[PDB]
Assembly symmetry: C3
């Protein structure tokens, strides 16, 4: 499937926030021509962000997952998402060898330029809210930013944050859909 | 081939509390591995038509279920009626009831059926729509994939609200979401 | 030449007139996924009345509207707030060289979203979202999008921006929002 990059939809940890493989990021990018249709959720399985307790830890209120890409749209190893887990769809799994090119899935650099001395516009951000444990009283903000990281040609970053004082709440989320303008 | 829908008319096609009390307008468009979904609801009669939470404070939510078999065919005991749920042709439907739509079904690995395994929240999408198009009349639309029994796939819409509405007609703005496709 | 996308281009060159000529860049991308249009929108105000919001100074400045009006062929009418010059089918990061003559497949569906009439008016022709000024999560503004409710046109898409906080010297430039709507054909 040449039109979807994804993480497979299983629950196998693939992401490192605070410690190795502490999370499963489920991310599906579907190319609808000039726009990428994106669907995301997160399951934290272990470590610092698995169970939030803001009584115990009042300043644990946010964290970031970064996807960094080179000029060919290939995932770079400083990304929180592991390289072995990210590929074009084949059935419910991934192609068995790493892809060489995915520029058509990258966030457009004219729409979303890299940091510079020029005025920075907010249109490179999408805000949404997801819900921990599927409970409507457990919001957390998912802030997605395009092309704002260094050490790469392109980037997608997910910042998760919350303003409520959660007491023993597992960090596993509902799903959110957004889109962005494609590089080509 | 590419869009399954209810048609865009306002003819009731859904039974929440009594027969044909509502029009669910639902459009599913297959963009490969994801289904792009667009939904709204008009209740025209019955218990959920005109909401008054001063006289009936406990009337705060209701559910509309779409149940599908192994071939993605809508089951008769869904709240949505089978008659006008089909692949699009113009502003109407193809003239033959579809036999297969597995590519429009919610992915079972992403969204497993109920079991004794852990239930993860990623099979839910939350949104908010607005009654009467008024920005001070929110209601929550909670969409859940593959959590019904007696089917192979399902999409469930739970509508709820926390405001104390006084004689407010339950007809909504539109909401867009997506989900991971079975194949 | 990308016939599946109508857009404004992704640059920041002003293309829109809210209160004075070319006071803003509306970035709007309509991508045809068959029976649905997948839409992505943001707004940058660069000058005039809506550039810098100060509701201490001007407590009544709380909202504005950007209208896109279309004829029977889906062509943008020149009384739209959006200018015709760079609304066109995509070619790379720019537009196709000549103005389009037909884009009916990008128009909002008139049965889903009928023009005003004696018949009951339903809310399903509206999409509500919230965007954030300056990308700050404590600076919400509501983006209300309405299909086919303007007169003097075959089809319309209108964006109403409003806020309910007392902003003091907040520049009106937004995060992005995605929605979809049912296409006419
Ligand atoms: C989808 C599921 C869901 O909605 N879950 C919510 C959950 C459930 O509804 C209930 O649990 C079910 O029973 O409720 C949650 O909250 C419950 C408590 N609660 C309190 C109030 C009274 N409010 C409380 C309040 C909180 N704030 C914080 C400041 O607000 C902002 C800000 O900084 O300006 C708003 C920003 O959007 C937000 N940013 C983001 O979310 C980023 C994505 C920020 C940030 O969260 C913080 O800054 C941290 O960075 O916070 N302020 N107040 C005071 C209050 C009262 N009202 C009444 C007016 O509300 C409406 C209305 O009904 O008229 C609500 C409409 O939705 C709104 N319409 C629109 O937005 C159209 C698009 C409408 C209009 O704006 C208005 O009429 C003008 O036209 O206003 N408003 N504020 N209420 N509930 C929970 O359990 O935690 C939240 C769950 O999300
Ligand atoms: Mg609770
Ligand atoms: Mg009111
Ligand atoms: Zn645990
Ligand atoms: Zn009614
Ligand atoms: Zn400025």
């Amino acid at each position: 499937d040449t039109r979807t990059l994804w993480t497979t939809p299983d629950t196998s940890p693939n992401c490192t926030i605070a410690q190795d493989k502490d999370s499963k990021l489920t991310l599906v990018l579907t190319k609808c021509g000039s726009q990428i249709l994106a669907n995301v959720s997160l399951i934290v399985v272990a470590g610092k962000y698995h169970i939030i307790n803001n009584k115990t830890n009042p300043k644990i209120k946010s964290f970031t997952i970064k996807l960094l890409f080179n000029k060919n749209g290939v995932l770079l190893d400083n990304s929180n998402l592991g390289k072995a887990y990210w590929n074009f769809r084949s059935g419910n799994s991934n192609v068995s060898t790493a892809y060489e090119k995915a520029i058509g899935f990258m966030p457009n650099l004219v729409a979303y330029p890299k940091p510079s001395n020029s005025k920075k516009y907010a249109r490179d951000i999408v805000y949404g809210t997801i819900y921990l444990g599927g409970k409507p009283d457990q919001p957390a903000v998912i802030k997605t930013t395009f092309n704002q990281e260094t050490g790469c040609e392109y980037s997608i970053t997910f910042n998760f944050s919350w303003s409520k004082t959660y007491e023993n709440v597992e960090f596993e989320t509902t799903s959110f859909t957004f889109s962005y303008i494609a590089q080509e």
